[PDB]
Amino acid sequence: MRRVRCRKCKACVQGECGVCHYCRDMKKFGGPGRMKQSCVLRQCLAPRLPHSVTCSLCGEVDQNEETQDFEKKLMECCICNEIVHPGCLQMDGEGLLNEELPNCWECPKCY
Ligand SMILES: [Zn+2]
Ligand SMILES: [Zn+2]
Ligand SMILES: [Zn+2]
Ligand SMILES: [Zn+2]
Protein backbone atom coordinates (compact mmCIF):
# COMPACT_ATOMS: atom_id res chain seq x y z
CA MET A 1 0.00 0.00 0.00
CA ARG A 2 2.84 2.47 0.98
CA ARG A 3 4.36 3.70 -2.29
CA VAL A 4 7.75 4.94 -3.47
CA ARG A 5 8.97 7.83 -5.62
CA CYS A 6 8.77 7.21 -9.46
CA ARG A 7 12.03 9.27 -10.09
CA LYS A 8 10.58 10.32 -13.53
CA CYS A 9 7.87 13.02 -12.96
CA LYS A 10 8.24 16.87 -12.90
CA ALA A 11 8.28 16.79 -9.01
CA CYS A 12 10.91 13.97 -8.77
CA VAL A 13 13.49 15.49 -11.23
CA GLN A 14 13.26 18.90 -9.40
CA GLY A 15 16.11 19.57 -6.91
CA GLU A 16 15.43 20.28 -3.19
CA CYS A 17 14.53 24.01 -2.95
CA GLY A 18 16.33 24.50 0.44
CA VAL A 19 13.79 27.14 1.60
CA CYS A 20 10.42 25.33 2.27
CA HIS A 21 9.52 24.16 5.83
CA TYR A 22 10.50 20.51 5.01
CA CYS A 23 13.93 21.49 3.50
CA ARG A 24 14.70 23.85 6.46
CA ASP A 25 14.09 20.86 8.83
CA MET A 26 16.64 18.62 6.97
CA LYS A 27 20.09 17.99 8.53
CA LYS A 28 21.79 18.96 5.18
CA PHE A 29 20.21 22.46 5.55
CA GLY A 30 21.15 22.69 9.28
CA GLY A 31 17.77 21.61 10.72
CA PRO A 32 16.93 19.02 13.45
CA GLY A 33 15.89 16.32 10.94
CA ARG A 34 12.85 15.01 12.85
CA MET A 35 10.09 15.50 10.16
CA LYS A 36 11.83 13.21 7.55
CA GLN A 37 9.55 14.54 4.77
CA SER A 38 10.53 15.41 1.24
CA CYS A 39 10.81 18.98 -0.17
CA VAL A 40 7.27 20.37 -0.80
CA LEU A 41 8.29 20.82 -4.54
CA ARG A 42 9.34 17.12 -4.86
CA GLN A 43 6.04 15.41 -3.88
CA CYS A 44 5.83 12.54 -6.52
CA LEU A 45 2.91 12.97 -8.98
CA ALA A 46 2.73 9.21 -9.77
CA PRO A 47 4.14 7.03 -6.88
CA ARG A 48 4.98 3.39 -7.68
CA LEU A 49 4.66 0.12 -5.74
CA PRO A 50 7.97 -1.04 -4.09
CA HIS A 51 9.99 -3.73 -5.99
CA SER A 52 9.56 -6.16 -2.99
CA VAL A 53 5.72 -6.37 -3.44
CA THR A 54 4.47 -9.86 -4.50
CA CYS A 55 1.30 -11.38 -6.10
CA SER A 56 -1.31 -12.67 -3.54
CA LEU A 57 -1.91 -15.84 -5.63
CA CYS A 58 1.59 -16.98 -6.79
CA GLY A 59 3.92 -15.03 -4.43
CA GLU A 60 6.11 -13.73 -7.31
CA VAL A 61 7.27 -10.09 -7.85
CA ASP A 62 6.37 -7.75 -10.82
CA GLN A 63 8.05 -9.26 -13.94
CA ASN A 64 7.02 -6.54 -16.49
CA GLU A 65 10.56 -4.92 -16.55
CA GLU A 66 11.86 -8.01 -18.48
CA THR A 67 8.64 -9.64 -19.93
CA GLN A 68 6.95 -6.37 -21.25
CA ASP A 69 3.44 -7.97 -20.74
CA PHE A 70 0.45 -6.34 -18.83
CA GLU A 71 -0.47 -9.80 -17.34
CA LYS A 72 3.10 -10.06 -15.75
CA LYS A 73 2.65 -6.60 -14.10
CA LEU A 74 1.48 -6.34 -10.53
CA MET A 75 -1.86 -4.50 -10.14
CA GLU A 76 -3.24 -3.11 -6.90
CA CYS A 77 -7.03 -2.90 -6.46
CA CYS A 78 -8.10 0.53 -5.12
CA ILE A 79 -11.29 -1.18 -3.74
CA CYS A 80 -10.15 -4.51 -2.11
CA ASN A 81 -6.35 -3.57 -1.83
CA GLU A 82 -5.36 -6.98 -3.35
CA ILE A 83 -2.09 -7.08 -5.38
CA VAL A 84 -2.16 -9.67 -8.19
CA HIS A 85 -0.84 -10.44 -11.68
CA PRO A 86 -3.86 -9.92 -14.02
CA GLY A 87 -2.86 -13.29 -15.60
CA CYS A 88 -3.18 -15.12 -12.24
CA LEU A 89 -6.95 -14.20 -11.97
CA GLN A 90 -9.27 -17.15 -12.86
CA MET A 91 -12.34 -15.06 -13.94
CA ASP A 92 -13.22 -12.93 -17.04
CA GLY A 93 -13.15 -9.12 -17.15
CA GLU A 94 -10.70 -6.27 -17.83
CA GLY A 95 -11.41 -4.35 -14.59
CA LEU A 96 -11.23 -0.52 -14.50
CA LEU A 97 -7.79 1.12 -14.94
CA ASN A 98 -6.97 4.04 -12.58
CA GLU A 99 -5.36 6.92 -14.55
CA GLU A 100 -4.18 8.78 -11.36
CA LEU A 101 -1.77 6.06 -10.03
CA PRO A 102 0.40 3.49 -11.93
CA ASN A 103 -0.28 -0.31 -11.36
CA CYS A 104 -3.73 0.59 -10.00
CA TRP A 105 -7.27 -0.47 -10.97
CA GLU A 106 -10.69 -1.67 -9.81
CA CYS A 107 -9.97 -5.40 -10.22
CA PRO A 108 -12.35 -7.81 -12.21
CA LYS A 109 -13.80 -9.07 -8.84
CA CYS A 110 -14.66 -5.50 -7.67
CA TYR A 111 -15.60 -4.14 -11.16
ZN1 LIG B 1 12.08 22.35 -0.33
ZN1 LIG C 1 7.58 11.05 -9.29
ZN1 LIG D 1 0.72 -13.98 -9.72
ZN1 LIG E 1 -10.70 -5.69 -6.10
Report all structural domains of the chain as residue ranges with CATH numbers, in order of start: 1-5+47-111 (3.30.40.10), 6-46 (no CATH)
What technique determined this structure? X-ray
Spatial neighbors of 67 by CB under 8 A, at least 6 apart, are none
CB-based contact 47:101 (threshold 8 Å): yes
Return d(Cα 52, Cα 84) in angstroms, integer.
Answer: 13
Spatial neighbors of 99 by CB under 8 A, at least 6 apart, are none
Q: Which of 34, 28, 27, 38 is nearest to 5 (CA)?
A: 38
Considering every ligand atom, which ligand is closest to the CA of 77? 4
Considering every ligand atom, which ligand is closest to the CA of 59? 3
Annotated binding site for Zn(2+): 6, 9, 12, 17, 20, 23, 39, 44, 55, 58, 77, 80, 85, 88, 107, 110
